[PDB]
Nucleic acid binder design. Structure first.
Lengths: 123, 86, 113
RNA sequence: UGAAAUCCCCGGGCUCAACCUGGGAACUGCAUCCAAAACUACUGAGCUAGAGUACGGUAGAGGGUGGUGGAAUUUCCUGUGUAGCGGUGAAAUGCGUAGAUAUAGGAAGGAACACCAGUGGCGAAGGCGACCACCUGGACUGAUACUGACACUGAGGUGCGAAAGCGUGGGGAGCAAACAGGAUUAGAUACCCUGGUAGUCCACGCCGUAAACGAUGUCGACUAGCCGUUGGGAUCCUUGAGAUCUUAGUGGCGCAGCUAACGCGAUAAGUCGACCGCCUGGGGAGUACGGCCGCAAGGUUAAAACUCAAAUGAAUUGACGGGGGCCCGCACAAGCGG
C-alpha cells in the first residue's frame, strides 16, 4: 500500500521538476505538508493553496529557474530506519537551504536551538 | 449465493436499515456462502480452482472478525453467538 | 530490518600456511629429499624436502640454495612462502640451522668471506 | 556518575629526545529530574480517498461431474478384385493350394478435438481448446447505497505445482525410453527403416521437481507521445464504413531517465516507498555428513579439506562455418589428348 505520504510529495515534485510540469497536485495532509511551506518559503513563493473541503489537495506551483530547475536532489526521508533523529549532527551540504525537519513542535530548519526530524535539500 | 438468500441474510443482520456493509452483514454473507459451498466439495473434490475462492472467503471472514473483536466485543460476542462460529 | 533480524557476518580468511600454526618458523625432520618438475611454462630439476614437522604435520619445503646437503634425516627449520612453479608446496627450508655453503656473496642466507 | 594511568592540547624537568610530570580537555556513555509537543508510538472520538459489502450487466479454452457428436487412424468381418512396397542422402521386414496396400460397404474400440484460431482470451502459477446440460470460482463493468483503515507484506507454516517416475486397480487406437532385428559407417553401442512392452489414457494415492522464464518478488504512488488489439462504459450530425475521450488487460515503437553494454522505457530495468527472499571469485558442489520428508527414484536444508589466478557479462575487430543472400572467372558440358 501507500504508506509514506511525504515521500510521495517529494517524488511528485521531483518527477515534475524532471519533466517541465508547471503545477503538481496531491492530496496531502497537515503540517508535514506544510513541509511545502518551508520548501517554498526558503526557496521561492508559490500560491501553494491547499484547496478543497473534504479531499484537500495541495498544489505546489513549481517554477523553472532559469534554464533547468532548482530542485536537483530532494528526497532523503526516514520512514522506518532510513532516518534522521539528530541532535545537532544534521545536514550541512553547502550550509545552504538545508534540510526540512519534521519532529515535535514546529517544522523549520537550522535557526533556533536544536531538535531534528527529516526532509531534504533544495539543491 | 442466491439473490433472495443474499437479501435475507442482509435482512436479519442489518443494523440501521440502509446498511449492507457492516462487518456483521459481511461475516454473515460469507458464513452462509462457506457453509453452502461445503456441499459442493464433498461432491466435487477435485475442484481445486474453486477451493481457492472458498479459502478466500474463510480468510476474508477471519480478518473481519479480528477487526470487529478488536473494536467492539459486544457486537463480536453477539455475532459469534449467532452463525454458529468458533 | 532484514539486517536487524540477521546482521552481516564477515567472512573469515583461512591461512595459506596451515602448518606452523601462527608461528614464524617451526622445525621438523626431513622425511625424504628429492627433485620434482615445475609447472608447465617452466623446466628445471628443483630440490624439495618432504619434512615431517614437529606438530605431526608433514609438508614439503623448498631448498633455496645453489646446492645443499640435507641428507634424508636432517633437522631443518621451515618458514612460510609458496614456490609458484612447484604445485603443492608452501614452505621454504631456511638456510642456516643446518647448512649454508657455496659462494653466495650477495647474501642471506649464506657464508661470509 | 563515567577510577587512575593512557590518548589529546597547553606547560614544567631530563644537556636534547625518549621518558617523567602539572593543569586542562576528552571519556562520544549511563541514570535521575525539569520543560517542549513539528513527527513513526499509545488512548479517546471521527472522516472517506486505501480496503471490503449489497445491486444490475456483459466477456471468457477458469475449475468439477456427467452425456452427445463428427472427422481420422487401427483391428475385425464380408463383396470387388490381380502382382506387388522406384521410401530416399540407398536397400533390406509383413503377401499369392492363407489373395497382396483396397472397395461405393458394415461393426468395434480407445485417444485426440481440423476449420474457428487471433503479439486472442481465462487462471495465483502449473495450466486450460469440439458441443450441450448441471454444480461452482474469480475478474471486468455501470450507477447507487453501506462499513469506516477493516490495509500492505510476510521468517515459520500450510496449500496448489509441466513432464517423466511410483505404488493399486481398469484401459490400450495411435505413438513409443527399453529391446529385437534391417541398414549406414573403422566401429555405430546412435541419427534413418520395420516392429514393439513400460509409459502416454481413466480412477484414487504419492512424489514436489523443470531453461517451473518475462532468466525480472509482491503492493502503492508518480513520469513525453504515437500505432494496433481484447472485455466493458460514456460522449459524437449520425447513417456507422465509423470517431473521440475513459477504464481493465494484451502487444509494437520511442522522449526523459537509467544501464557495463545489450537494452528497459505507464506491463520500467525511470523516479521513489513498505516488506520479504537472495548473492559474496572459479572449481570442489547444490556434493559429502546430519536432520526432515518419500514406498522408491530421490528431494529439501547444507558444508569443509584441497586446488587455481582467474572464471564471468556485454560489445568490438578479424579469422572461420557441412549459415544465408548477391557476384565473378573454359569453374560447370562445346569440335582436344596421356
Amino acid at each position: 500500500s501507500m504508506q509514506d505520504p511525504l515521500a510521495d510529495m517529494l517524488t511528485r515534485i521531483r518527477n515534475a521538476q524532471m519533466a517541465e510540469k508547471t503545477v503538481v497536485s496531491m492530496p496531502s495532509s497537515k503540517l508535514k505538508a506544510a513541509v511545502a511551506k518551508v520548501l517554498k518559503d526558503e526557496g521561492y513563493i508559490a500560491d501553494f493553496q491547499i484547496s478543497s473541503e473534504v479531499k484537500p489537495q495541495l498544489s505546489i506551483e513549481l517554477k523553472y529557474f532559469e534554464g533547468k530547475p532548482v530542485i536537483e536532489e530532494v528526497k532523503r526521508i526516514s520512514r522506518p530506519g532510513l532516518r534522521q533523529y539528530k541532535s545537532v549532527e544534521q545536514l550541512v551540504r553547502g550550509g545552504l537551504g538545508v534540510s526540512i525537519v519534521s519532529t515535535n513542535k514546529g517544522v523549520m530548519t537550522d535557526r533556533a536551538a536544536r531538535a531534528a526530524g527529516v526532509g531534504g535539500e533544495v539543491v | 449465493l442466491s439473490v433472495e438468500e443474499k437479501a435475507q441474510i442482509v435482512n436479519e443482520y442489518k443494523q440501521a436499515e440502509g446498511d449492507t456493509g457492516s462487518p456483521e452483514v459481511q461475516v454473515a454473507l460469507l458464513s452462509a456462502n462457506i457453509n453452502k459451498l461445503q456441499d459442493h466439495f464433498k461432491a466435487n473434490g477435485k475442484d481445486h480452482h474453486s477451493r481457492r475462492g472458498l479459502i478466500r472467503m474463510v480468510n476474508q471472514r477471519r480478518k473481519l472478525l479480528d477487526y470487529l473483536k478488536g473494536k467492539d466485543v459486544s457486537r463480536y460476542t453477539a455475532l459469534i453467538g449467532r452463525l454458529g462460529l468458533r | 530490518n532484514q539486517l536487524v533480524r540477521k546482521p552481516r557476518k564477515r567472512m573469515v580468511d583461512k591461512s595459506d600456511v596451515p602448518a606452523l600454526q601462527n608461528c614464524p618458523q617451526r622445525r621438523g625432520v626431513c622425511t625424504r629429499v628429492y627433485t620434482t618438475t615445475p609447472k608447465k611454462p617452466n623446466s628445471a630439476l628443483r630440490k624439495v624436502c618432504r619434512v615431517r614437522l614437529t606438530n605431526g604435520f608433514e609438508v614439503s619445503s623448498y631448498i633455496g640454495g645453489e646446492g645443499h646437503n640435507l641428507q634424508e634425516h636432517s633437522v631443518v627449520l621451515i618458514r612460510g612462502g609458496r614456490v609458484k612453479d612447484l604445485p603443492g608446496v608452501r614452505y621454504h627450508t631456511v638456510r642456516g640451522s643446518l647448512d649454508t655453503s657455496g659462494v653466495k656473496d650477495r647474501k642471506q642466507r649464506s657464508k661470509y668471506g
